[PDB]
Amino acid sequence: FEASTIGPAFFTPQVLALEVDCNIECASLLDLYGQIEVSRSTFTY
Amino acid sequence: FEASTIGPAFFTPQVLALEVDCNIECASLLDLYGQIEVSRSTFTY
């Protein structure tokens, strides 16, 4: 029963516990800006 | 009887223990890469 003459169904592959992830996100400046809290869609100053 | 008249076969030289060796094995990058071990011929990720 040479592997070259039988179906893949008999050979279950190993499952690695890794996950390639190439995505990145650039640093944010949000901490510099001034923080304001509101409770309505419109405001005045 | 003297050397330069008798043949070389009458003298047995001393045998030293040191074994000269000039070859080198360059340092490998292998330990920088990511290390994985698989007990099977195929793996998935």
Side-chain angles (χ1 to χ4, degrees), chain A residues 10-40:
Chain A
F10 298 107
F11 303 109
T12 52
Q14 180 90 354
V15 179
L16 301 184
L18 62 83
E19 183 178 1
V20 171
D21 185 10
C22 288
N23 304 287
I24 48 173
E25 61 195 300
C26 295
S28 65
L29 306 179
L30 194 71
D31 291 331
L32 302 170
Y33 304 152
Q35 313 313 80
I36 292 175
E37 173 195 330
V38 305
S39 66
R40 306 188 212 292

Side-chain angles (χ1 to χ4, degrees), chain B residues 1 6 8 13-14 18-19 23-24 26 28-32 35-36 38 41 43-45:
Chain B
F1 295 141
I6 64 176
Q14 176 81 359
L18 63 90
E19 186 165 25
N23 308 273
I24 62 170
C26 305
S28 63
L29 279 294
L30 200 76
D31 66 279
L32 294 176
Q35 304 296 301
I36 295 164
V38 298
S41 181
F43 50 85
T44 307
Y45 62 98

Side-chain angles (χ1 to χ4, degrees), chain A residues 1-7 10-11:
Chain A
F1 294 123
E2 289 87 2
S4 185
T5 71
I6 63 178
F10 298 107
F11 303 109

Side-chain angles (χ1 to χ4, degrees), chain B residues 4-27:
Chain B
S4 79
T5 53
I6 64 176
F10 288 105
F11 302 89
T12 299
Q14 176 81 359
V15 185
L16 301 180
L18 63 90
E19 186 165 25
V20 173
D21 184 6
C22 307
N23 308 273
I24 62 170
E25 190 180 334
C26 305

